[PDB]
Every structure is written in structure tokens, then in C-alpha cells.
Design a protein around this ligand. Structure first.
Ligand code: ZN
Ligand code: ZN
Lengths: 50, 78, 50, 99, 107, 209, 199, 49, 50
DNA sequence: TTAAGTGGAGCTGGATGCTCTGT
DNA sequence: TCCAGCTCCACTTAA
RNA sequence: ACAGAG
């Protein structure tokens, strides 16, 4: 994302099992590294590095 | 004996919390003492931390045999 | 009037901070004109919309 | 010791300190520290002040004397190579034609 | 070689007669007896090159030297710069570093 | 020439020695290390040397199994080997009561004889190798990991450890050159020892199909 | 003229960005449609939907690409040992010599819980410990350190200091990081392969 | 339906299906594409199929 | 636009939204800020229990 | 002399990125 | 706009 | 069917 007129989508899951498969497997705290080469993606960016 | 892994995988953890949250969403008895919680998933995770969930995970090998592991005897982790 | 600086951290990727007391005084004020038309035809039968 | 670069806080690769916290102290300690950084770094940077200007890209006097000499030497050696191709022998590099 | 009939100007063919080989037209009686040696030399292009290559000087006739790579820091280097992807608003570089023959190639 | 032609008759003979040593046939140690200058001794250059029937190998017996389990190696002289030369080798093989034979063709085989080598007999199995494939031992190549043909008592322990069938293994074809090197038929299992980036080794298995 | 040439060099970047999208998405669609069935079973094999085996162990090692703390490897022993020496300095314990280190390392590694690991990981641990012990001997040969603990400038025991508590925590941390780095059964490993090659 | 003018609703396309497989999310991939789009039941004769 | 790609493997869903995005660093890395105009439309069916 | 098995050449049918936002 | 299968036709071996 | 946007 780049905040220049960017549209993102949303989905509210409608089942308790659809919640718990989304929280345990798909959360941001459980997806910090990319599955490709194990490098972290959620980290600091410009003005947090500067 | 049982030869499969002793660590609970993320898929077992996710589906046990899901099925336990769907049971607590219906009027099932709760094995822990809740302290004001309303979301069923949070009560499921409190039951998971205290090792009280009455689910037996049956693991099917690809030949057809199985192994019945308890939730309270798999090593939980993050 | 533009100051070029790093301010408040809501301006990371192309986002820009505005002034609340400039938008109130008339800056950025736009108007949107739309349309709504309706036709009332006469038929081959001697009858008509109304 | 040492300042914090892109290769220590940023999203590039390993030896990230948040990756160290992820692998040694759990998920939740890597997530709190990024929120503390996201909270703390604009408070410092927006009260230090940090700005760019046309004077931040203007060439000094040391550059304008170097650039003239470099352009003259480069254009002269290119002209000598032009004359050496068109009017005689060029030391033809291996694998390629004279052009 | 093409040779053409003085009469009708069709193309002659070589055939054999009772005393000589003849150039003969296909459409008129004209024939020309080959009395003496006649020739046509092609002189094709020989394979002029031998083309040995890959020398180290043929590798390092590019600008960069005594810079810094993020892997092994050696001076003898071979750099590259690209920009031809405008989804990449940052620049693009690739570097080769061969003083100790370490041979890195990264971004 | 004649420095490079006798080179081929040396190198092909050396590779056939190694191919017979890897199939469990009895090969002496000196034939596996027969030097080029020593190959000059028992056969000189092409005016003194003779190509087609002087370099045959019929000494090869299965020292694991049995001394009557024997195998020919023939070097035909014409480049495209017709049916007639195959019939000559087959009647010679009929005379000596041998069941297995190899044929090293020089340029190719006529398409009615490639059809012949399949359907002459199930008891008379014959293998066509080009002489250009035998100029290098493909097992010595660095892209080819070491294959080992497995016994039935090892296939049975393989299929009991993972609880499999035969048709769930990965496959190797019989037209595979490394399969034709070992001479393996449908229903055998090979063990492939793959080298790793580390000092470790990963073992895997393929069924001939 | 320079502006026109620089615009020529920029439109190539724009057109490569624009062509890149239809250039790659069909490839990723093919990879996903061909690889979406593969799964890591509970018997450490990778099978298709029909039951045939694609791999006997996943990747050779049985391990997860998302959990590699090194260059395609599960640990990096220098960093782990430095972490354990920094988190647990044991100031009231004697620093081990070479042979005492080898003795306590082979003493811990023959317990019951280390048998679950692969053999190559245990060989790499023993190789690393032998390297550390040779560093200890190369230091204690230079500075005249006697292994009994009685040389008077006691700063010399700060040079390659290693205690039995740090060795125990080291081996437990390495073993726990190896056992949690395995590919968990049920992982849609073909879809991860397809995305990590198509991206 | 399709768009914002028709109160449409968004699209789990072909590519976003491929991401939910990679997480191993089975019931979420069931809930998005069956329960909350077009769930339905039919009467099936088990004899003639 | 057939059945298999257009209506079976991928299909339009409800309980979904779509908006322009904008940054906010005062949130955590695992939170998201939903506007109230979308939070009233989107619903989660919560079962009544004790 | 010709029956036949297999090469090479031309014809045919398939495919070519993800969404919203409007007329 | 690019690329695998299918079918037609000369070209040797073999009797 | 065309134009946009990321
Ligand atoms: Zn004429
Ligand atoms: Zn380098």
C-alpha cells in the first residue's frame, strides 16, 4: 500500500470457526516473516528509520 | 505406542479453538471460571491455556490408521 | 503555503497533513453538480404519462 | 554502540532486532516493540525538525571545477577513439567488431 | 553464369552434342560449341576469425573500482545500474566483486 | 587419424568393462585399468588391428549368481545394422546357450531391427547401445547421483516402513539411459543417493515403469 | 535533446511495468493450478491428492522455509551461543577447559530427549563445540592460563569463558529451535511453493 | 450483484482463493465461498444419481 | 466470465466493504480502524448464551 | 519389383492479469 | 499474436 | 462498448 488514492477490501467472517481460523493462522503477529525466504516484512519504514 | 509429533501444530490449534468456540457459542458448559468474558473465542483460549478442552484430536495417517492424541498432552506453543 | 517537514507521523507514504483552520476559511472547498432527468412521452395509442 | 540503519530496524532482511525478538522472546514482544517505535520516532522527529531544500542539492564550488575537468578529459579520449576507429587501427577487443 | 541467346534472349543451358558440349537455347535452334576452356570462379569468404575471449581485462573495462560492496568490501569491482522498471521508484543496481575472487552478485 | 580411432575402441571397451563390473559380472582388476599404451600391445592401429570380432567380450559371467549365466558384448562393423547381422549374433548366442547380449552399433540401427530386438524372444534379451553413449560413463558424471538396484527383501522393507503399494512410488522409465546402464526391467526399485549442499545425504526411491 | 533521450529511457520503465502484469499472472495461475494439491502428511511425506508420493521427506530436511534463522539453515550457532552467554552470565561458576567442555557436551547429548533429532544436526552441534573448545585452548595456551583455576590475574578467565549452565541452556535452546522448525503436518506446501516462485 | 450503484459486494477472485489455501484455512474458505454467497440445498435421488 | 472461473472458483461475497486507505501510527500493528458508516452495515451474528 | 515403418512438412485448434468507478 | 497434436507424403530396408 | 483509478 502507498496511500495515494488506494482502495483496499474488507471481509467480516460470519462463523466462529471462520474467526478462529483467521486469528490463529492469518494474524499479523503470526505472519511477520515471509514464507519465501524467512525475512521479516512487518518492520519499520521511512520516518521510522530516519 | 504413538509415533507422530508431540507438538500441537497451528492447524490443530486453530480448529480446536474454532470448534470449542462454536461449542461455547451454543449453551455448552464451560470448564474454566470466566471473569466477564463475552467473546467465545477468548473463553476458548482461556480453556486452551489451562489445558481443559474436552477435544481428542484424531490424526489420520495416509494409509488409514490413526492416533488419538489428547489436547491436554500435546505441547502447546506459539 | 507549504512547509516541507516530517510532522506527526501520519505523513509517511505520500500522505500529507492539512491545516484545520485553513479548511474552515475556504481552502479546498469544492462543489459537485449532478443530474436527474425524466421524460414524459406520448404513445402510439392516444395515452400519455403524467 | 552504533546507529540504527535500514538493515537493523527495517524490512530488508535478517539481523533485524525485531526478528531477534521474534525468534527469542515470542510473537508478542516483537509486536509491542514495533508499536513503541511507531509511537516514539515521530515524537522525536517532529520536534527536531527535518527538512529538504534547494540548497540541499546545489553543487558547491569543489564540484564545478572537478566536473569541467572530467568532461574535458572524457570527451577528448572519446574523440581520440573516434579518430582511431575512422582513420586507422583500433585495438579491437576480443569477441566484437571494430564498431 | 547467366548467358543469354542472341536471337530470342532466353537463358542458355549446357548440354552435350556429337562433337562438343554446347550452350543451347530451349526455344530456338541456336547452339554455341565450347571449343576451349571456359571458367567462372566464385571466390567465397573464408572463416576469418579465431575468436578467443573472456580475458580479465575484457571483463574490467567498465568504470568502477575501489568501491564498497555489502558482502566482502573488496576494491576490484564490476558494477551495473538499471532504472527500466518504473514500478521501482527507487534505483536499481547490481555489483560484481572479484578482488579475492569472491564473486558476489546482489542488489 | 588412427590416434583417435583406436582411442574410441579403447574408451568404449573400458566403459563396457565398468558397465559389466556394475551389473555383478566378474571383471578382473586389470581390465578395469587397461592402459591405452597397454591396449596398443594386444591390438595396434587399424592396419594391424581388426574392428568387428577381435574386441568381443564373452568372458562375462555373473559371479554373484552362476557361472553359466553369461553375457555377450558384440561390436558390429557396418554403421546401420540390419536384421541379418542380428540373426548371425542370435544363432551364435543360440550355439553357446547364452541368454543376454549387448550390441554396440556405430551409427544407428535400422527401424525393422529395433522392432526385432523386442519381439525375437523374451528369453533372448538384447540391448542396443550407440558407440557415442559409451564414450563416457554416465554414472561418473557429476549430475548423476549413485543408483543402486534393490533386492526384493529390501523393497519389502521399504513398502512396510511407509505402508505403501508399488504403484505409489515415484517412477523411472526403462528407456532411461541410466536404467539401461544397469539393465533393469519393469518391477525393480532403484535407490538414489542424492548429495546435498551439506555433508548430509537424502535417500529416495524410484520404481521402473 | 537530453530531455528527449531521458524521456526515451523512462518510457521503457513505464512500459515494462505495464507489460509486467499480464506477463506474470498467467504463469502464477498455472503454477497454482498445478501445485495446489500437495500436502505434508503426519508421516513426514509429501503426497498428492491421489495418494502418490512426491517426496519422501519434505525438502530433504523436513523443515520449514519460514523458520530459518540463517541462510536456508535452522540455526546459526555463533549467535545462539553469544545470546546464551549474554542472557545467563553465571558469575559464581568456574570456566571450563577444553576437555571439560567436551566431557559435559557428550554427557548432555546422550540423554533421552536428543534422540528425536536428525543425525546431521547433532554432528553439526558436535563440530561447533569442538571449534569452541579449540578456541579455548588457543587462548589458554597464549596467556599461560592453568586449567586448575589458580592463575592470579583473574581477568584471564574472562577471555573464552564458558560455564556448564551456559552449555546446558545452549543445547536445550538449539534442540528446541530445531524441533519447532519442522514443517508442521497439514501444510499446503505446494501452494506456498507456487506463490514463492510466482511472486 | 456487481457494483457500488447496485449495492454489489466484493469479489474473492481466483488469486485471493490461492492465498487462503496457503494458510491452510479450510473453514474460512468454506464460509467465504459457500455460506456467504450462494448456499442452497437440493433433493438428490441416491439410486439413479 | 464462464461458470468455472467467473462463478465457481471465485464469486462475489457479502459482508464486505471497500474504501480509500490512509495511515495511522497510533494503532498497533495488528489493529485496523473501521469507519462507523461501515461498522453499522456489517454485522456479526452473535448467538445468545450465558 | 513392392510392403511397410518412419522421417519431415503443412493444417488445426487452443491460449494470452486483477479488481472497482462511471456513461 | 505464439505453440503442441494430427495427418499427408516421400525414403529407405527387406522380401 | 469506451474512459478512468490503484
Ligand atoms: Zn534462343
Ligand atoms: Zn561481493
Amino acid at each position: 500500500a502507498d496511500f495515494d488514492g488506494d482502495e483496499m477490501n474488507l471481509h467480516l467472517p460470519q462463523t466462529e470457526e471462520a474467526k478462529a481460523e483467521a486469528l490463529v493462522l492469518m494474524g499479523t503477529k503470526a505472519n511477520l516473516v515471509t514464507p519465501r525466504n524467512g525475512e521479516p516484512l512487518i518492520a519499520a519504514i521511512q520516518d521510522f528509520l530516519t | 505406542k504413538r509415533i507422530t509429533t508431540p507438538y500441537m501444530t497451528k492447524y490443530e490449534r486453530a480448529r480446536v479453538l474454532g470448534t470449542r468456540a462454536l461449542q461455547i457459542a451454543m449453551c455448552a458448559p464451560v470448564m474454566v471460571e470466566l471473569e466477564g468474558e463475552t467473546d467465545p473465542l477468548l473463553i476458548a483460549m482461556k480453556e486452551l491455556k489451562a489445558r481443559k478442552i474436552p477435544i481428542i484430536i484424531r490424526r489420520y495417517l495416509p494409509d488409514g490408521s490413526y492416533e488419538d492424541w489428547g489436547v491436554d498432552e500435546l505441547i502447546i506453543t506459539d | 503555503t507549504v512547509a516541507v517537514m516530517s510532522y506527526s507521523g501520519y505523513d509517511i507514504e505520500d500522505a500529507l497533513v492539512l491545516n484545520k483552520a485553513s479548511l474552515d476559511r475556504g481552502f479546498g472547498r469544492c462543489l459537485v453538480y449532478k443530474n436527474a432527468k425524466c421524460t414524459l412521452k406520448r404513445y402510439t395509442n392516444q395515452t400519455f404519462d403524467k | 554502540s552504533g546507529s540504527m540503519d535500514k538493515g537493523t530496524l527495517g524490512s530488508g532482511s535478517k539481523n533485524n532486532i525485531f526478528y531477534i525478538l521474534l525468534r527469542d522472546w515470542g510473537q508478542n514482544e516483537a509486536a509491542d516493540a514495533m508499536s513503541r517505535l511507531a509511537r516514539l520516532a515521530p515524537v522525536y522527529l517532529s520536534n527536531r525538525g527535518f527538512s529538504i531544500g534547494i540548497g540541499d542539492v546545489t553543487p558547491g564550488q569543489g564540484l564545478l571545477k572537478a566536473k569541467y575537468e572530467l568532461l574535458n578529459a572524457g570527451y577528448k579520449k572519446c574523440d581520440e577513439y573516434i579518430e582511431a576507429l575512422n582513420t586507422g587501427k583500433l585495438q579491437q577487443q576480443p569477441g566484437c567488431t571494430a564498431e | 553464369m547467366l548467358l543469354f541467346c542472341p536471337g530470342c534472349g532466353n537463358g542458355l543451358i549446357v548440354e552435350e552434342g556429337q562433337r562438343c558440349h554446347r550452350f543451347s537455347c530451349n526455344t530456338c535452334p541456336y547452339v554455341h560449341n565450347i571449343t576451349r576452356k571456359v571458367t567462372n570462379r566464385k571466390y567465397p569468404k573464408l572463416k576469418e576469425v579465431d575468436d578467443v575471449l573472456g580475458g580479465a581485462a575484457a571483463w574490467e573495462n567498465v568504470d568502477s573500482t575501489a568501491e564498497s560492496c555489502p558482502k566482502c568490501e573488496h576494491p576490484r569491482a564490476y558494477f551495473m545500474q538499471l532504472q527500466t522498471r518504473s514500478a521501482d521508484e527507487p534505483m536499481t543496481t547490481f555489483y560484481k566483486c572479484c578482488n579475492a575472487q569472491c564473486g558476489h552478485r546482489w542488489r | 587419424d588412427d590416434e583417435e580411432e583406436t582411442y574410441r575402441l579403447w574408451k568404449i571397451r573400458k566403459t563396457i568393462m565398468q558397465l559389466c563390473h556394475d551389473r555383478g559380472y566378474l571383471v578382473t582388476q586389470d581390465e578395469l585399468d587397461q592402459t591405452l599404451e597397454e591396449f596398443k600391445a594386444q591390438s595396434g592401429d587399424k592396419p594391424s588391428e581388426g574392428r568387428p570380432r577381435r574386441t568381443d567380450l564373452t568372458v562375462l559371467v555373473a559371479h554373484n549368481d552362476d557361472p553359466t549365466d553369461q553375457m555377450f558384448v558384440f561390436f558390429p562393423e557396418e554403421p546401420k545394422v540390419g536384421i541379418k547381422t542380428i540373426k548371425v549374433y542370435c544363432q551364435r548366442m543360440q550355439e553357446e546357450n547364452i541368454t543376454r547380449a549387448l550390441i554396440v552399433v556405430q551409427q544407428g540401427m535400422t527401424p525393422s531391427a529395433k522392432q526385432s530386438l523386442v519381439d525375437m524372444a523374451p528369453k533372448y534379451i538384447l540391448e542396443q547401445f550407440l558407440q557415442q553413449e559409451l564414450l563416457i560413463n554416465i554414472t561418473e558424471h557429476e549430475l548423476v547421483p549413485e543408483h543402486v538396484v534393490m533386492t526384493k527383501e529390501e523393497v519389502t522393507e521399504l513398502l512396510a516402513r511407509y505402508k505403501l503399494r508399488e504403484n505409489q512410488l515415484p517412477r523411472i522409465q526403462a528407456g532411461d539411459p541410466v536404467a539401461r546402464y544397469f539393465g533393469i526391467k519393469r518391477g525393480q526399485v532403484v535407490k538414489i543417493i542424492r548429495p546435498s549442499e551439506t555433508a548430509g545425504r537424502y535417500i529416495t526411491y524410484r520404481l521402473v515403469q | 535533446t537530453e530531455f528527449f533521450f531521458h524521456t526515451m529511457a523512462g518510457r521503457e520503465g513505464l512500459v515494462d511495468t505495464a507489460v509486467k502484469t499480464a506477463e506474470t499472472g498467467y504463469m502464477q495461475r498455472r503454477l497454482v493450478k498445478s501445485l495446489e494439491d500437495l500436502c505434508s502428511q503426519y508421516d513426514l511425506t509429501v503426497r498428492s491428492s491421489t495418494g502418490d508420493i512426491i517426496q519422501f521427506i519434505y525438502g530433504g530436511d523436513g523443515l520449514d522455509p519460514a523458520a530459518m534463522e540463517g541462510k536456508d539453515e535452522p540455526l546459526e550457532f555463533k549467535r545462539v551461543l553469544d545470546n546464551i552467554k549474554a542472557v545467563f552470565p553465571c558469575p559464581s561458576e568456574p570456566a571450563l577447559s577444553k576437555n571439560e567442555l567436551i566431557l559435559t557436551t557428550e554427557s548432555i547429548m546422550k540423554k533421552s530427549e536428543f534422540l528425536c533429532c536428525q543425525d546431521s544436526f547433532l554432528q553439526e552441534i558436535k563440530k561447533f563445540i569442538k571449534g569452541v573448545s579449540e578456541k579455548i585452548k588457543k587462548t589458554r595456551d597464549k596467556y599461560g592460563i592453568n586449567d586448575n583455576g589458580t592463575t592470579e590475574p583473574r581477568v584471564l578467565y574472562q577471555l573464552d569463558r564458558i560455564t556448564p549452565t551456559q552449555v546446558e541452556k545452549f543445547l536445550e535452546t538449539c534442540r528446541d529451535k530445531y524441533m519447532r522448525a519442522q514443517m508442521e503436518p497439514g501444510s499446503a506446501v505446494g501452494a506456498l511453493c507456487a506463490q514463492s516462485i510466482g511472486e | 450483484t456487481e457494483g457500488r450503484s447496485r449495492d454489489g459486494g466484493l469479489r474473492l477472485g481466483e488469486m485471493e482463493r490461492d492465498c487462503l489455501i496457503g494458510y491452510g484455512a479450510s473453514m474460512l474458505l468454506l464460509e467465504r465461498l459457500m455460506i456467504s454467497s450462494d448456499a442452497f440445498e437440493v433433493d438428490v435421488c441416491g439410486q439413479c444419481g | 466470465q464462464g461458470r468455472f472461473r467467473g462463478n465457481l472458483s471465485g464469486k462475489r461475497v457479502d459482508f464486505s466493504g471497500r474504501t480509500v486507505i490512509s495511515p495511522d501510527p497510533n494503532l498497533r500493528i495488528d489493529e485496523v480502524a473501521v469507519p462507523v458508516h461501515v461498522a453499522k452495515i456489517l454485522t456479526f451474528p452473535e448467538k445468545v448464551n450465558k
